[PDB]
């Protein structure tokens, strides 16, 4: 039953150890589902956004045989390793709006999708036109380079009561290298093309 699965998880899950298999990197899939655009300032180039951050990855230290057992459980994220994702152009702390629970499938596949309110620095010019503005958000591991964590991409849920509407969303994979460091860090660049409603 579920208590057993959680107990075993508590026994074997190592929340501070990245679950790399055969010394290849962990493949993290990240996809943003925009829910609201709350505040926009064309002068400062700052936006206040609400989004579901769909995150999936594999951790075999959580897996169990589900032949006559449940095949999925909800588990506190503190009992699990979670990717240390950060939005590189963020200017507020992510405000998590939802219960911090992840879904674990018996094969060790993990899905964690918090609802997040966060403020970003990005290009707001054109928000009042019909081409719209395009705000770019880059999300990637803060401390794990491309050999430890890879980041891959995978408007339906957007609020009808926003002052804004979404024209398009593109999610592309990027990789940034730095002076200080020899390795490249992956991110997904999320282009939010949106404009103020007419």
């Amino acid at each position: 039953d579920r208590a057993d699965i959680l107990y075993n998880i508590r026994q074997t899950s190592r929340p501070d150890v990245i679950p790399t298999q055969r010394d290849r990197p962990v493949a993290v899939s990240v996809s943003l589902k925009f829910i609201n655009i709350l505040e926009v300032n064309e002068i400062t180039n700052e936006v206040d956004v609400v989004f579901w951050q769909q995150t999936t990855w594999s951790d075999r230290t959580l897996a169990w045989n589900s032949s006559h057992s449940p095949d999925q459980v909800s588990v506190p994220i503190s009992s699990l390793w979670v990717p240390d994702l950060a939005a590189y152009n963020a200017i507020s702390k992510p405000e998590v709006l939802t219960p911090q629970l992840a879904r674990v499938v018996s094969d060790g596949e993990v899905l964690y999708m918090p609802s997040i309110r966060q403020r970003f620095s990005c290009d707001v010019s054109g928000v009042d036109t019909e081409s719209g503005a395009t705000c770019r958000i880059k999300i990637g591991s803060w401390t794990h380079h491309s050999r430890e964590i890879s980041v891959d991409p995978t408007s339906e849920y957007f609020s009808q009561y926003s002052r804004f509407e979404i024209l398009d969303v593109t999610q592309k994979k990027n990789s940034v290298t730095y002076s200080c460091c020899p390795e490249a860090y992956e991110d997904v660049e999320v282009s939010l093309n949106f404009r103020k409603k007419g």
Copy 2:
């Protein structure tokens, strides 16, 4: 006595384990008792509301024979499993204003009713009219589908006489939604708050 009951509750309650019995779902009742409407913005469609979030459910692992005992106790919710409920259109963290204590009956019936201040995105249009505005708030489990958690409904009586607004009607209807991504159904209660400026 009460130390005994709390002590056994500490022995038996598994706060991270959903108390499903025989693989039926936990049946959760949710009812919002509105106390105040504090800030209203028709331009941005945002409201600041205070409500008592009446939440009831059963956890039989908490039960005790109450023949020569109290049949009810107050218990910190951190000692209990609580449903992972979220308001889908919330745009602030719920700010809990009250002591986070639930009431537990000897048969394992749990009552948790925090007073909550929260900000929502919803249709504020018509608030200064005689029809009023109708703000809809949907509350449901964030990670548990209908085979694990069911949500059912069970309001001017508690509403502040000092609000600038008055309540015209409250309707609570249950929904059950299936998704693109996912094979299972998720239940919610939709609370339609019809209110206007005095």
Copy 3:
């Protein structure tokens, strides 16, 4: 000594267990001592207030013989049961400004008086007049009914001129704190509260 008294207190105190004796309720005395009034909004009927919440009750499981010991000690409230008081018309979380320490007397009497800043919904009308405004705040247990917790004022009436800031834009004309026992539709039980009427006006 003090280290011993706190040791015994930790041996026997249970913060999640109301210290009811002989199936009777715990008698809680509550008194709000207002120190400042920060914001008042007559349009929205809201106030921002700072007050000392004098809270006393008895817990006989903490008692000790003080013939050759101190007769009073300070204890983290995380080591004690404290009443789950809430103001029914609060519109913000209580913000505690002071060290969260309770005073425990050798006979088991507990005094906890946090300094608190909080916002309330209440009648602000007349505050710019000379009759003043009268804002009523009700404080009672959130989850314990009258057979488990009773709530009383310590003293009912004062002008509070011993505690209220002289540098406020407001002055206090009167504070009367009276006991109530108010009921709800849903429930067969009565809940006790103290209703605190703050009569104050803008200077």
Copy 4:
């Protein structure tokens, strides 16, 4: 070594028990070093202030022989008893800006100096003149009376005061006081800090 000292302190320190020696009081020294005056409101009589709260006292239960060991260490305040000091006229929670670490000397002398931003209710009248306003802040133990805690002052303190503030400090006086209340038979000691300051 330093780990040994931290261990010994954890063994002898009772962070929840006041370190009175044979029922005489703990002598706490308190001194405010003003760093900035951030917001000032003459209509509401409120000021937003940043200050270093120098707090020193003795806990002989922490002492050790430092003949060939360090004579001082830094320790999380959670490992120590600290005085339950509070400002009687504060209207906000003190916002601690610095790491919450105390310095402990091998003779058991403790220094804790948080940098604090806090908002107060006090006399702001005259702030736009050349005599300036004089704001009084009272800091004392919240729950310990004078036989348990005594409070004494330890300057212009403009030595640390910010030059980029809109305000300047004309004088700071720190006087010791001890005030009694109606209900109760005992007095509580405090340091009253007088900030004479004006708009530049």
Copy 5:
């Protein structure tokens, strides 16, 4: 492997004890990488900044033989000693925007770089001109003097700055300071960071 390295760190790390090698000081390198200027107030002399706080130091108790193992790991900072650095003219709590993880190399070298949003008191005069304003930020250990913590610059500091800010960076200079105070017999080291920036 990595579980073994973390287990080993957890076994050997002493998070509340400063890891001096003999009686030499712990050498912390500090470098601020400015990312944004969010708010600027020329009347009050206050700025709101976002920056990456590059912090490096060595702790050999964390060292391991990485012969056929990984040479680096990510570790929660709660498992490590980290220097009690504080900004001397800050007027808000540092708000950490990023996961609070440090990078540890097999030789005991630690890299911790949080993204931080913080408000400072500093000279904002000239921001609407072409000389620009020069805001100066001082960062150093709050409680460890120079015989326990040394603080030095690394060496850019403005390459990763947002192109979408209302402001631009004209120059960043980082110099080392060393101050002794009236009260205390020791000197405390800091890094001074000069941010020359203007409104576009």
